[PDB]
Fold Recoverin.
Amino acid sequence: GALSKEILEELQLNTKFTEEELSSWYQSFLKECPSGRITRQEFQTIYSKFFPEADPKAYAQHVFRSFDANSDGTLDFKEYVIALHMTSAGKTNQKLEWAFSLYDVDGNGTISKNEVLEIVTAIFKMISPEDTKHLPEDENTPEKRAEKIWGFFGKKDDDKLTEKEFIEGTLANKEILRLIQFEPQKVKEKLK
Ligand SMILES: [Ca+2]
């Protein structure tokens, strides 16, 4: 009710649901998760189920962590709905602040070279083996993709990437957007 309103406030035009629809989904959510909280393991199970061609555990863990840099505890319904929107609905360029939170693995406010590699690796595991053969040579392994991203940002190995820079680059350089892309269907689509 007031819960759905908060979801709409945060998603705005990213939403695929009205307030009434969210409330119905919530009532169903509570039948299966009566506390209204979902653990990381439970969240991972959703992705394992719906991406049978992939190895989604790492990806789902990073998505769960995106909100607070914490693997422990739970998501509430709001965070769970937002997470599913981030992975699955809408346009990547409407998700850039969230994408920064995804890439900032340790939550310290900047992205390191290793963090890019970690997230790129997790996303890469969402790609079916069939589909990976059709990636460009210079973008067909996690190391190649992560190093390309780092190079597009003009970064030395020990440099830190700020949110300001990340947003600028992902807006302006469409090659950066393509390489940081985290939605499994989109990576697959622009692949084919
Ligand atoms: Ca960081």
Q: What stands out?
A: The pocket of calcium ion is lined by residues 104-106, 108, 110-112, 115 (CB under 6 Å). The beta strands are 37-39, 74-76. The radius of gyration is 17 Å. The chain has two domains: 6-91, 96-183.
